[PDB]
């Protein structure tokens, strides 16, 4: 009796992105999951943060500050109802799947805005509850991404550079920041040169994976306990941990590379 | 630098914001040195950040299987792009220097600016598969990010909780700007602006204005040149074997994205080297 939310960011029902979403819904239902959807284009979701996101009375309409105002509105219950409806789907969900095409080395604008409007302070993060101590630490998230370019272009030696660096801002900075356990991304390269028969196998592989998704070991991020979590220490790594890491050849993660070598496929493969 | 044109793109809804103050400072300083300055204030324009069919005003090649990249390109060549897009494209064509002023939001650009990239940077106009990176169409132009953050600089140091800022900037500076040919200059990073006392804020504006007086003479950031790579589908756009052999013995990689499994050159995306 577990709940999945699927967030889709593609305008076209004829797209492979849409096929992947449908495959995911079908596979999860068959294993007895409840499945909810946020198909952002079909919903005409508004991706722009603004004053209109607060329906009540602004604390300071002369010097409007979205982070402070949005948080008050969350606590006092005057957030725009489109936001609240999305927040409730998240609260209920155990597993969150994000299905989208890579666009300009990141998430589509409409999905970026969903994060901006929905992941409000106090709901999705606090100063005290970041990263592995975040509110969504009981939940799991996975990115399912399609690219036009081939895998070689995003290898260590490819023209675009390491895919692991491209995913880091999203998987660390958005998902893990709010507490999500992040699973290995589903990467579908060069979808535009892939014939129908192959596409069907890929969907079959996706469906097969989703049968056991909940058992998978997540990606590694540096635990928050390695850091001094307060304003005076500057949220720096503890001195003792610095001393223990001095002599190692590899860094901890893509973002915590510490000037050394980045552990291989830190953002693509779990250590297991 | 007289005779030269700057475009300033702003992504902030509030005229009372420090972001807006930074834009105004930039406009003032550039005009005083005789630049022509054009603005795209995306919130003031109510810019539509969502790609759709309505971006093509003519006839779709294939309405049954709609694919934005193919359709947008045809529309660019045949001249039936939505005119809001074209007006932005014309500002870009004319501009020598592009400044992007925005607050960091979820470790990147605001959605409204992300959409501007998606709607404006159309194939053939801003990139081709033959003209990528340093061979791209905008290779005569310079771009600079000016970013404000809520969190402090320590949080984005090598040992900070959020991790190296260099990694955060890479997808934007390499993947969007340099991909289209821009020479990318050192970013202007303004940390913890909300907890900065007034007198410091004033110095920051003054420093920004002083920098802009000689911005055109600055050395750009280092990205691996395209000439290190076999640019064709059979080679897989991999680095040439000979270049791999020359790099085998070095301790540092080439860039954040081209770290090659080794150490990342210090402040690759924050500081230029000469
Ligand atoms: C603004 C923008 C920026 C971009 N930036 C990048 C970038 O930075 N990097 C990059 O690599 N790419 C980039 N791209 C390319 C983009 O990532 C691809 O267009 C995307 O991955 C394509 O997937 P799709 O779902 O749109 O498939 P489509 O091309 O829309 O569909 C593929 C085919 O699969 C078929 N299909 C659908 N369902 C099934 C099924 N069940 N069985 C069999 N066949 C089926 C469809 O009918 C169609 O023929 C960008 C594109 C845009 C528009
Ligand atoms: C959705 C969202 C996501 C975010 N994600 C992140 C994140 O990932 N990382 C992060 O670090 N931060 C993040 N933030 C915080 C964000 O980066 C800051 O709120 C923003 O950078 C502050 O800039 P501002 O221009 O809005 O500040 P404001 O609060 O508008 O301005 C700061 C101060 O400058 C004063 N000021 C205005 N004009 C002048 C002037 N002319 N001279 C002097 N002082 C002046 C203002 O009155 C105020 O005191 C996020 C915020 C949002 C809304």
Curated annotation (Swiss-Prot), chain B:
One Gene Ontology molecular-function label: NADH:ubiquinone reductase (non-electrogenic) activity
GO terms for biological process, alphabetical: cell redox homeostasis; cellular response to oxidative stress; innate immune response; negative regulation of ferroptosis; negative regulation of protein catabolic process; nitric oxide biosynthetic process; protein catabolic process; protein polyubiquitination
Region (Important for apoenzyme conformational stability): 225-274
Keywords from the named record: Cytoplasm, FAD, Flavoprotein, Isopeptide bond, NAD, NADP, Oxidoreductase, Phosphoprotein, Ubl conjugation
EC numbers, comma separated: 1.6.5.2
Catalytic activity: a quinone + NADH + H(+) = a quinol + NAD(+); a quinone + NADPH + H(+) = a quinol + NADP(+); ubiquinone-10 + NADH + H(+) = ubiquinol-10 + NAD(+); menadione + NADH + H(+) = menadiol + NAD(+)
Covalent link Glycyl lysine isopeptide (Lys-Gly) (interchain with G-Cter in SUMO2), residues: 250-251
Main location: cytoplasm
Modified residues (Phosphoserine): 82
Induction and repression of expression: By dioxin. By oxidative stress.
Residues annotated to bind substrate: 126-128
Variant or mutagenesis effect after changing residue 105 to Y: Decreases the catalytic efficiency toward menadione. Increases the affinity toward NADH. Increases the catalytic afficiency toward nitrobenzene substrate. Has no effect on the affinity toward NADH
Binding-site residues for FAD, renumbered to this chain: 12, 18-19, 67, 104-107, 148-151, 156, 201
Role description: Flavin-containing quinone reductase that catalyzes two-electron reduction of quinones to hydroquinones using either NADH or NADPH as electron donors. In a ping-pong kinetic mechanism, the electrons are sequentially transferred from NAD(P)H to flavin cofactor and then from reduced flavin to the quinone, bypassing the formation of semiquinone and reactive oxygen species. Regulates cellular redox state primarily through quinone detoxification. Reduces components of plasma membrane redox system such as coenzyme Q and vitamin quinones, producing antioxidant hydroquinone forms.
Family, per entry: Belongs to the NAD(P)H dehydrogenase (quinone) family.
Protein name in UniProt: NAD(P)H dehydrogenase [quinone] 1
Naturally occurring in which organism (per UniProt): Homo sapiens
Source species taxonomy: Eukaryota, Metazoa, Chordata, Craniata, Vertebrata
């Amino acid at each position: 009796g577990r709940r999945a939310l699927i967030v889709l960011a593609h305008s076209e029902r004829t797209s492979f992105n849409y096929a992947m979403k449908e495959a995911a819904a079908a596979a999860l239902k068959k294993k007895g999951w409840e499945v909810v959807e946020s198909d952002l284009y079909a919903m005409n979701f508004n991706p722009i943060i603004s004053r209109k996101d607060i329906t009540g009375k602004l604390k300071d309409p002369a010097n409007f500050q979205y982070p402070a105002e949005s948080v008050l509105a969350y606590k006092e219950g005057h957030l725009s109802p489109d936001i609240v409806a999305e927040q409730k789907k998240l609260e209920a969900a155990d597993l969150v799947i994000f299905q989208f095409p890579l666009q300009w080395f990141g998430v589509p604008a409409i999905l970026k805005g969903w994060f901006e409007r929905v992941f409000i302070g106090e709901f999705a993060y606090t100063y005290a509850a970041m990263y592995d101590k975040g509110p969504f630490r009981s939940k799991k998230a996975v990115l399912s991404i399609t690219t036009g370019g081939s895998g070689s272009m995003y290898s260590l030696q490819g023209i675009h550079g390491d895919m692991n660096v491209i995913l880091w801002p999203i998987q660390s900075g958005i998902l893990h920041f709010c507490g999500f356990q992040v699973l290995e991304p589903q990467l579908t390269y060069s979808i535009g040169h892939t014939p129908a028969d192959a596409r069907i196998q890929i969907l079959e592989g996706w469906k097969k994976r989703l049968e056991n998704i909940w058992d998978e070991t997540p990606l590694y991020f540096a635990p928050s306990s390695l850091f001094d979590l307060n304003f005076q220490a500057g949220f720096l790594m503890k001195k003792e941990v610095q001393d223990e890491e001095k002599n190692k050849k590899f860094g901890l993660s893509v973002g915590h590379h510490l000037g050394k070598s980045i552990p291989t496929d830190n953002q693509i493969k779990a250590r297991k």
